[PDB]
Design a binder for these strands. Structure first.
Lengths: 75, 97, 109, 95, 83, 95, 109, 97, 83
DNA sequence: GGCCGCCACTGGCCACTGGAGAATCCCGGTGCCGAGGCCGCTCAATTGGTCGTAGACAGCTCTAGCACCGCTTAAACGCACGTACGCGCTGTCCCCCGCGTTTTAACCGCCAAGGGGATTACTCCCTAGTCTCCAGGCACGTGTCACATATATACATCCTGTGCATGTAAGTGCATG
DNA sequence: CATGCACTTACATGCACAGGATGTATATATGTGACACGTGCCTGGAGACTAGGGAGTAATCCCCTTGGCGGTTAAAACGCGGGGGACAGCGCGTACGTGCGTTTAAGCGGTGCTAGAGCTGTCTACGACCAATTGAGCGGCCTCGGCACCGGGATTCTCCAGTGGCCAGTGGCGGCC
């Protein structure tokens, strides 16, 4: 079981802290390295990242929706 | 609730049907009209054997169909399932036309 | 004092007319002289080819449980042989239809 | 009546009964086989004429017919056509 | 006497039927007029030759045997009409 | 001792000097022109032969050649060739 | 006692050999008789085609400042004419090269 | 730093050169070796006119070069600049090879 | 005498040269062997034809006339070799 | 006492599945019209001989290819470092087939009419063929200048450092809480 | 005193421009062989003349093609809609591009040999030509049974509604600080 994928996405984006936001591909590779069945849960990842965007805790840099780059808010 | 098939299912059944079929798909007399219309552009008031019209219909449908398999190959080669006129232009340019 | 007029197709054990094909070569203007065995060889080659295409046509008609051969069966036979289709790729049969062929990407999941 | 028009109905019917005594034939398919045999015949005649011209040969004989059928027919079709024609040439040679 | 628009006689559903015979699953809306133009090109290419044959035959009636001659001239030999 | 071989050299060179008196030529380009003029010669000749067969004529006339030009040569080259050949035939008729 | 020799090419007023083309057509086996105007007409057509392609090759050579015709000049002359390209879409030329031609997407920016 | 062109610039320059040039793009001796290698498989002790081998050459680059413009048309149809062997396969099959 | 893999005698940079003459910008690494097979098929067809001409000619040596006859048999006519 | 982390309750979402509906395949049945078999005709395959020649071989020749060898760089290979390109993913918007309805003209099918395809006859224009004679084009030899090659400038153009237009964020003086 | 804010000011990013470097053009010098041009010849093409025969032309007729008229419905067209697909954006990892160093092997000159292409004489096998003849194959007829169309049931496919599992949102409580 464990925690839901939202917290895992938060450590996935917080692992790098590049100038550009993390891609969908890079966070998928990060969840693959940390361990997740990403092949079964692409829609789960998309809804989790979009939900985190809607809270304003994450801000999308260049892409729209689930594409492009994703970086943390100001605080 | 009135049934509605999901898109392309009827199209695939059409593909199976008309691959199974052998008959001409063109309306015969409009084809004759167009053949005579092109004919008078070369020589007016000519007569036609109906066999000549049927032969032109067969050859025309065959050339068109082979063009469409080439177009289908180009479209799937472009990783698409919808054919485009640019696909046809590509196919004709490959064929040397 | 003439002997019985025997036929050259029977002399070669063949079905296709040796005399008619020799006449066609003499009047088709390919050379002014024609070697005697050449139309025999040609008729044998044609008989062989017709034998295989007719055999495949009868096989296809039997596959479609049909007792009388069809131009659809001719198309299905001529296109399903690799060497025959390579021989006759640019040639179309009237009312032949097409091979049943759907690309895998066209097929649904 | 009218003038005689040449056709290949009887020979193809005989060959059909050689390969399939049981089955029938449609007349439009018969026209297809006539077109087929005439097309192949005129092809082979053309390359025979060309090859006889290349060797400057006034007489068309069986050897370049063999050459032309090996040239056009792909692979085992060509080899078995050579075999059948060679057999028939030997039998007619033996009258 | 004259004819002005019969190229539109090759209707869109007929082209759809041909495409389903061609194995095309999905057809754009821009296809049909371009196929009409392509068909027009092919038909005029064969029938100019056919008119040439028929006039060289000193006939005013178009025969199918000349259509066979024209089609086999352009490498598109058809079986089922020879003779 | 060598056997004489045919070429189109004098005719192509003279028509070159007619169309461009100041222009030379390379020899392998002349070989290409030899192949071209030969190739079109058998194209027109084969068309004339089969057209003579189709109307069952054993004599190929200028009408057959002109028909073959309308067949193989498309568009403007055909009608220009027809006009110049008609002029040549008319001049030969006067000759 | 005999008329002086006068060529049939001159009788047409042409340069291409009437007698040579006549002999080649007779020995090329296309019909057992041939009309008198047919080889004259044929030689006229070939002379016209040779003259026009030689004009085009001359223009191509003059554009590249070369006095003599090159197979590159022939390739450029034939491939840049849509009429002659449709005449010779299936003809290849020794040492000819191709048209200088690039796709726009292959160009930068 | 040393001079270094960006990718494609050298490709453009050599495209312009080889389109401008007519000279053979195959080393002649291994080509002749491959011709003899293939021909020995069909008939033994075959000898060659060097001109025959050369004609076999320009036929080879003719067929190959035309195949690559077909491939390039497929690639620009496929919105790419890098050709892949299935593009060549598409060109062959649409031509009917 | 006996030759083994002269198909690789067509070097990869020669294939790049042929592609650049065709105006190809970027070439995959998978291309070269596949094109080697394709040209192998092409060469074996035309040399089969040219050979068949040659033993019919009762000659041991291949002539260029046989080659150009083979190419025009395939609708791939080549000019400039005495045809 | 408050706040956060963890455990539990709960609703939403995704896939699995069964069943209904519809298109299709399969099964006789039956009238009907091409298939094929018979029959009468005719023309062309045969049969036989002859004459003239087409090509196969003997022999001979010279020539082009085949191999060897020996230098001699050009490029092929190979490695390395970097960008740019296939390509995978997703968001989004719109395009086109499914389906139902309306119209419409195509098609059967029927009938009139006449036109030219085709067939037969007839007579003749040409042309294939033969012999004579002769000049045209090709082999042969030569010479000579258009072009190949080399080399030195000259510009084009492409990459790159960098100089200016624009976004950003922080420091701090000042007004005021 | 303190503190937040706003204004000012330094920092950073991207676009634009000058400048170098190298590749390509381009201008001048030099040989050379390839193209072009005079020459002998013989051989292929023109000249004269004929036979006859394929081809042009007249006549006809009938069959095929065109023209037209009514019914009916399949066929096309039109509209709604709603899902699936095209496609743009974005990024990423990699796989060729580019560049530099090496090996080698491609390429050129020169030697030598002989299979082998190819020319020439013979002459003989073979095939075209020609007269009779027939029987095989083609035109026409007629019957039938295979099969196209029709009608009925089973089957299969599909699509969507019902259902359970899976996951995340939410609440509540204990424990520690």
């Amino acid at each position: 079981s464990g925690p839901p994928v939202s917290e895992l996405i938060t450590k996935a984006v917080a692992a790098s802290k590049e100038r550009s936001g993390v891609s969908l591909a890079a966070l998928k590779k990060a969840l693959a390295a940390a361990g997740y069945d990403v092949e079964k849960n692409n829609s789960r990842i998309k809804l989790g990242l979009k939900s985190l965007v809607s809270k304003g805790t994450l801000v999308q840099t260049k892409g729209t929706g689930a594409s492009g780059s994703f970086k943390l808010n100001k605080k | 609730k009135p049934h509605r098939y999901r898109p392309g299912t009827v199209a695939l059944r059409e593909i199976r049907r008309y691959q199974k079929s052998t008959e001409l798909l063109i309306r015969k007399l409009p084809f004759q009209r167009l053949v005579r219309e092109i004919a008078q552009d070369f020589k007016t008031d000519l007569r036609f054997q109906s066999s000549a019209v049927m032969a032109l219909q067969e050859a025309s449908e065959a050339y068109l169909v082979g063009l469409f398999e080439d177009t289908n190959l180009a479209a799937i080669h472009a990783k698409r399932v919808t054919i485009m006129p640019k696909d046809i232009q590509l196919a004709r340019r490959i064929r040397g036309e | 004092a003439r002997a019985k007029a025997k036929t050259r197709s029977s002399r070669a054990g063949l079905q296709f007319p040796v005399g008619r094909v020799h006449r066609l070569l003499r009047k088709g203007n390919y050379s002014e002289r024609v070697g005697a065995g050449a139309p025999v060889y040609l008729a044998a080659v044609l008989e062989y080819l017709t034998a295989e295409i007719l055999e495949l046509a009868g096989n296809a008609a039997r596959d479609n449980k049909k007792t009388r051969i069809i131009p659809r069966h001719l198309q299905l036979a001529i296109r399903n042989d690799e060497e025959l289709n390579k021989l006759l790729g640019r040639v179309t049969i009237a009312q032949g239809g097409v091979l049943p062929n759907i690309q895998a990407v066209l097929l649904p999941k | 009546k009218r003038s005689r028009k040449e056709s290949y109905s009887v020979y193809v019917y005989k060959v059909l009964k050689q390969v399939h005594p049981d089955t029938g034939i449609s007349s439009k398919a018969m026209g297809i086989m006539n077109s087929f045999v005439n097309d192949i015949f005129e092809r082979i005649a053309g390359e025979a004429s060309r090859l006889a011209h290349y060797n400057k040969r006034s007489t068309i004989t069986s050897r370049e017919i063999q050459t032309a059928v090996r040239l056009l027919l792909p692979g085992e079709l060509a080899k078995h056509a050579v075999s059948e024609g060679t057999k028939a040439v030997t039998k007619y040679t033996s009258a | 006497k004259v004819l002005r628009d019969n190229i539109q006689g090759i209707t869109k559903p007929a082209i759809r039927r041909l495409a389903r015979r061609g194995g095309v699953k999905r057809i754009s809306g821009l296809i049909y007029e371009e196929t009409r133009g392509v068909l027009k090109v092919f038909l005029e290419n064969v029938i100019r030759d056919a008119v040439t044959y028929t006039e060289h035959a000193k006939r005013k009636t178009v025969t199918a045997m000349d259509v066979v001659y024209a089609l086999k001239r352009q490498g598109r030999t058809l079986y089922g009409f020879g003779g």
